[PDB]
Structure 1
Amino acid sequence: PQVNGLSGRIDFHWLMLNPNDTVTFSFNGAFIAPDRASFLRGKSMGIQSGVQV
């Protein structure tokens, strides 16, 4: 179904590389490759709300 004008869809997958391990991507098409990785800075708490801060 049309969402933002496109009837195609991208499926986002994820894994968590442990330190010193290696991830490998074989692909001959239909790939959305990561440019940058992401690391967690510490601890926090998330909530869901609709009120003033």
Structure 2
Amino acid sequence: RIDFHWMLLDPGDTVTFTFNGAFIAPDRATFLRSNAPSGIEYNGKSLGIQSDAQID
């Protein structure tokens, strides 16, 4: 099994990773789009639903 643990990192904060093994390492950081500065990545405030229906 592989178990994933996550955190939210404030700006200017270091996450320090220390390990002798068994460790699965992040290659990329995930940034929300509704925290963007309107620098055109920015696409604000989604609603996530659970649906069995098609799209239209």
1:25 to 10, 17, 40: 17
Structure with the bigger RCO (C-alpha within 8 Å, sep 6+) is 2
Match of 2:50 in 1: 48
RMSD: 0.5
**Quick one: percent identity of the two aligned structures?**
76
Indicate the residue corresponding to 1:4 in structure 2. Answer: none
Q: Cα offset for 1:19?
A: 0.3
1:8-49 C-alpha deviation (Å, 9 max, x unpaired): x00000000000011000001000000000000011100000
The answer for unaligned runs of 5 or more in structure 1 is: 1-8
TM-score normalised by structure 2 residue count: 0.78
Q: Which runs of 5+ in 2 are unaligned?
A: 35-44
**TM superposition score normalised by structure 1:** 0.82
Give the residue type in structure 1 aligned to 2:29: A
